Scaffold this active site. Structure first.
Site, mmCIF file in Angstrom:
data_model
loop_
_atom_site.group_PDB
_atom_site.id
_atom_site.type_symbol
_atom_site.label_atom_id
_atom_site.label_comp_id
_atom_site.label_asym_id
_atom_site.label_seq_id
_atom_site.Cartn_x
_atom_site.Cartn_y
_atom_site.Cartn_z
ATOM 1 N N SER A 1 -8.553 8.398 4.074
ATOM 2 C CA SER A 1 -8.232 7.378 3.006
ATOM 3 C C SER A 1 -6.887 7.219 2.543
ATOM 4 O O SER A 1 -6.715 7.912 1.337
ATOM 5 C CB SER A 1 -9.280 7.248 2.058
ATOM 6 O OG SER A 1 -9.151 6.067 1.115
ATOM 7 N N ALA B 1 -3.455 5.361 0.775
ATOM 8 C CA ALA B 1 -3.274 4.306 0.140
ATOM 9 C C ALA B 1 -4.297 3.365 -0.384
ATOM 10 O O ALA B 1 -5.217 4.278 -1.038
ATOM 11 C CB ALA B 1 -2.443 3.262 1.157
ATOM 12 N N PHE B 2 -4.427 2.193 -0.219
ATOM 13 C CA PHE B 2 -5.423 1.212 -0.884
ATOM 14 C C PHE B 2 -6.215 0.587 0.260
ATOM 15 O O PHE B 2 -6.257 -0.975 -0.005
ATOM 16 C CB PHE B 2 -5.121 0.447 -2.068
ATOM 17 C CG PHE B 2 -3.832 1.073 -2.746
ATOM 18 C CD1 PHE B 2 -2.605 0.703 -2.285
ATOM 19 C CD2 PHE B 2 -3.787 2.059 -3.765
ATOM 20 C CE1 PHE B 2 -1.443 1.122 -2.850
ATOM 21 C CE2 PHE B 2 -2.819 2.630 -4.311
ATOM 22 C CZ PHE B 2 -1.489 1.976 -3.908
ATOM 23 N N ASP C 1 10.499 10.680 -1.212
ATOM 24 C CA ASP C 1 9.066 11.290 -1.367
ATOM 25 C C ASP C 1 9.193 12.201 -0.137
ATOM 26 O O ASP C 1 8.127 12.527 0.363
ATOM 27 C CB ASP C 1 8.061 10.358 -1.583
ATOM 28 C CG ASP C 1 6.751 11.137 -1.853
ATOM 29 O OD1 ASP C 1 6.897 12.175 -2.412
ATOM 30 O OD2 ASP C 1 5.580 10.541 -1.916
ATOM 31 N N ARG D 1 3.458 16.727 3.254
ATOM 32 C CA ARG D 1 2.334 15.977 3.285
ATOM 33 C C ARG D 1 2.598 14.470 3.886
ATOM 34 O O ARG D 1 1.801 13.707 4.219
ATOM 35 C CB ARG D 1 1.682 15.621 1.862
ATOM 36 C CG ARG D 1 2.324 14.566 0.999
ATOM 37 C CD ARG D 1 1.932 14.459 -0.518
ATOM 38 N NE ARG D 1 2.719 15.286 -1.115
ATOM 39 C CZ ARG D 1 3.699 15.307 -1.751
ATOM 40 N NH1 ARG D 1 4.409 14.177 -1.888
ATOM 41 N NH2 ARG D 1 4.493 16.115 -2.660
ATOM 42 N N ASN D 2 3.885 14.127 3.598
ATOM 43 C CA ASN D 2 4.426 12.908 4.303
ATOM 44 C C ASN D 2 5.084 13.091 5.749
ATOM 45 O O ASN D 2 5.528 11.959 6.127
ATOM 46 C CB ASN D 2 5.384 12.268 3.357
ATOM 47 C CG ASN D 2 4.775 11.856 2.139
ATOM 48 O OD1 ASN D 2 3.693 11.703 2.009
ATOM 49 N ND2 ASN D 2 5.727 11.919 0.934
ATOM 50 N N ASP E 1 5.771 8.331 6.199
ATOM 51 C CA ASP E 1 5.386 7.554 5.166
ATOM 52 C C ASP E 1 6.202 7.231 4.132
ATOM 53 O O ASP E 1 6.704 7.916 3.305
ATOM 54 C CB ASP E 1 4.251 8.446 4.206
ATOM 55 C CG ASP E 1 3.767 7.729 3.139
ATOM 56 O OD1 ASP E 1 4.455 7.849 1.979
ATOM 57 O OD2 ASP E 1 2.770 6.942 3.107
HETATM 58 C C1 LIG Z 1 -0.894 6.630 7.950
HETATM 59 C C2 LIG Z 1 -1.279 7.894 8.564
HETATM 60 O O1 LIG Z 1 -0.825 7.877 10.023
HETATM 61 C C3 LIG Z 1 -1.384 8.972 11.000
HETATM 62 C C4 LIG Z 1 -2.438 9.952 10.734
HETATM 63 C C5 LIG Z 1 -2.446 10.806 11.671
HETATM 64 C C6 LIG Z 1 -2.080 10.727 12.824
HETATM 65 N N1 LIG Z 1 -1.094 9.990 13.214
HETATM 66 C C7 LIG Z 1 -0.815 8.963 12.145
HETATM 67 N N2 LIG Z 1 0.180 8.012 12.633
HETATM 68 C C8 LIG Z 1 -3.820 11.894 11.015
HETATM 69 C C9 LIG Z 1 -3.916 12.581 9.850
HETATM 70 N N3 LIG Z 1 -4.982 13.727 9.835
HETATM 71 N N4 LIG Z 1 -5.280 13.502 11.093
HETATM 72 C C10 LIG Z 1 -6.495 14.468 11.604
HETATM 73 C C11 LIG Z 1 -4.617 12.728 11.920
HETATM 74 C C12 LIG Z 1 -4.741 12.610 13.249
HETATM 75 N N5 LIG Z 1 -5.225 12.514 14.558
HETATM 76 C C13 LIG Z 1 -3.337 12.477 8.547
HETATM 77 N N6 LIG Z 1 -3.604 11.058 7.680
HETATM 78 C C14 LIG Z 1 -5.298 11.043 7.457
HETATM 79 C C15 LIG Z 1 -2.853 10.222 6.991
HETATM 80 O O2 LIG Z 1 -3.355 9.303 6.532
HETATM 81 C C16 LIG Z 1 -1.301 10.115 7.204
HETATM 82 C C17 LIG Z 1 -0.666 11.142 6.604
HETATM 83 C C18 LIG Z 1 0.798 11.313 6.202
HETATM 84 C C19 LIG Z 1 1.354 10.193 6.983
HETATM 85 F F1 LIG Z 1 2.962 10.192 6.970
HETATM 86 C C20 LIG Z 1 0.707 9.102 7.680
HETATM 87 C C21 LIG Z 1 -0.813 9.231 7.821
#
Ligand SMILES: C[C@H]1Oc2cc(cnc2N)-c2c(nn(C)c2C#N)CN(C)C(=O)c2ccc(F)cc21
Ligand SMILES: C[C@H]1Oc2cc(cnc2N)-c2c(nn(C)c2C#N)CN(C)C(=O)c2ccc(F)cc21
Lengths: 288, 288
Positions: free
Chosen positions: A20, A22-23, A146, A150-151, A169
């Site tokens: 989850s 953002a919102f 940022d 984590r990003n 992000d």
């Molecule tokens: C917007 C989101 O995008 C992605 C999430 C994942 C893979 N590829 C993309 N593009 C992902 C994550 N975890 N896992 C197990 C997978 C998988 N497969 C991380 N996550 C839950 C996030 O929300 C997140 C965190 C940081 C960030 F920069 C973008 C994101």
């Protein structure tokens, strides 16, 4: 006329929930022919904007989508398509099966006390990857504001296949062609004290990022509460060097945290230093 | 009618000296169109038979070349051609730029005390590779009789690209379709006491091999002189377990050194156990 890549909501299937964000809600799914007619049911990630959410939040959501359309670079997460005509909104991102860098790092360290699943050369390659992405943002006159593990995102889940990390992000990124916040442990002293943000505060945070990489995802200033951190930093206190961290990489990091913003290296020099160290170290092992 | 792959001595250029093996001399060089007409000046290794050397040694040299023509398996060193009409004799082998396993392992451990450049999964893949080669030799009714890391080879010099190890020195291999020696630290008790060699003594030595892999190239029985070794072993003494070695891999190794030859696992079971452990461990990290 800036255009987001519109993609048929019909060709998209939301399979797995990844978390989850953002919102706010992210899923793994599949999207037919995203890469073209000879694509197939290729896997994607999907960022969603909750229904009924704030009109203002939708704008931040749209802001992000626009930032990511603008960017095209191997170390910047790809936005593959959008679904903006119907709610919930979808931002369709390339899937990075390694998840976020921070998690990917911590699994590497905690998988077996026979040793980390990421080696020094692996970690140096991660740093080289993100620093190229930073070079690029700077050249595009953007400040990320940022930078933290984590990003970022890793392209594979395993620790053997070739991997790449990308910055992923951009919720806080700002164009600089000329009351929120949180992550005190990544913020430059100017930023905490004066609310100032520049490419040089980005450099401070990249220093922290590469510290995160070299410790395999340890929390910065572990002995300091969020409150004490700014005291500590504002003083002149800095992180401890990672166990057995190469001197070359410590000197780089250290300079990223120069108290004086104009005493920090540039991103080009930071990438140079990283590539220079990598070659030195590769050469070093072979002649052994 | 067994035929060795004859190759034009003219199309071969000896560039680098890699070392002095046998009697004896190995070079890196290039060989035109070894892989076919669309090959080019592809790099090779070249094993040479000294001029004037013993008529008997030439026979051992020819024995080797014949063994290697017979074998065709991804984990067995390829013999790409021979130059046997003119002296010095040449056996032309595929180049394994990582050198011998033992050296490749020790460089991995000694390159930075930030940590080995080979991880547990890397090392398990090495074990899986060699064990497949052993399955194969057994199926071909051959006993290698000198399984040890010094006798295997790694396909790459770096520690990031995909790699494969192969068994690569069959100077002692024997067909078993029905006053020399040295390596006391790898020999089964039957072999040292009675001069007996079987697939089950090969299993004893593979146990030692995978111990070598898991310690990144430590010497077996470090506290024992060659002389004391047979005392130690003949007793019931065994190697110490590698630092933080997975219990599953210790139980496997341990069983390879069953005092009683028929109480040792087979190569098929050994490969099963290795693949089983790998999957278990991969699954293990992801669900974390
Ligand atoms: C917007 C989101 O995008 C992605 C999430 C994942 C893979 N590829 C993309 N593009 C992902 C994550 N975890 N896992 C197990 C997978 C998988 N497969 C991380 N996550 C839950 C996030 O929300 C997140 C965190 C940081 C960030 F920069 C973008 C994101
Ligand atoms: C017969 C020889 O063959 C090869 C040697 C090498 C690579 N590929 C092949 N085929 C090699 C070595 N070191 N280095 C730096 C390279 C390279 N590149 C090891 N070496 C000197 C050996 O003599 C040796 C050791 C064990 C074994 F099984 C075969 C050999």
């Amino acid at each position: 006329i800036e255009n987001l890549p519109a993609f048929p909501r019909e060709k998209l299937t939301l399979r797995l929930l990844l978390g989850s964000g953002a919102f706010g809600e992210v899923y793994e799914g599949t999207a037919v022919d995203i890469l073209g007619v000879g694509s197939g049911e290729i896997k994607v990630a999907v960022k969603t904007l909750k229904k009924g959410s704030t009109d203002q939040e939708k704008i931040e959501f749209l802001k992000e989508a626009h930032l990511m359309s603008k960017f095209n670079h191997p170390n910047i997460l790809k936005q593959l398509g959008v679904c903006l005509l119907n709610e919930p909104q979808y931002i369709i991102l390339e899937l990075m099966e390694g998840g976020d860098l921070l998690t990917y790092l911590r699994k590497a360290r905690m998988a077996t006390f026979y040793g980390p699943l990421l080696t020094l050369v692996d970690l140096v390659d991660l740093c080289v990857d993100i620093s190229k992405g930073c070079v690029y943002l700077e050249r595009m006159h953007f400040i990320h504001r940022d930078l933290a593990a984590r990003n970022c995102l890793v392209s594979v889940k395993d620790y053997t296949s070739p991997r790449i990390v990308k910055i992923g992000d951009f919720g806080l990124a700002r164009d600089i062609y000329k009351e929120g916040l949180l992550p005190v442990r990544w913020m430059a002293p100017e930023s905490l004290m004066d609310g100032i943000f520049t490419t040089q505060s980005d450099v401070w945070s990249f220093g922290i990022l590469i510290w995160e990489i070299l410790t395999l995802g340890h929390q910065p200033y572990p002995a300091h509460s969020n409150l004490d951190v700014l005291n500590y930093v504002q003083t002149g206190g800095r992180l401890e060097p990672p166990r057995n961290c190469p001197d070359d990489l410590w000197n780089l990091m250290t300079q990223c945290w120069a108290q004086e913003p104009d005493q920090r290296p540039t991103f080009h020099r930071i990438q140079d230093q990283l590539q220079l160290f990598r070659n030195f170290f590769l050469n070093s092992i072979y002649k052994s």
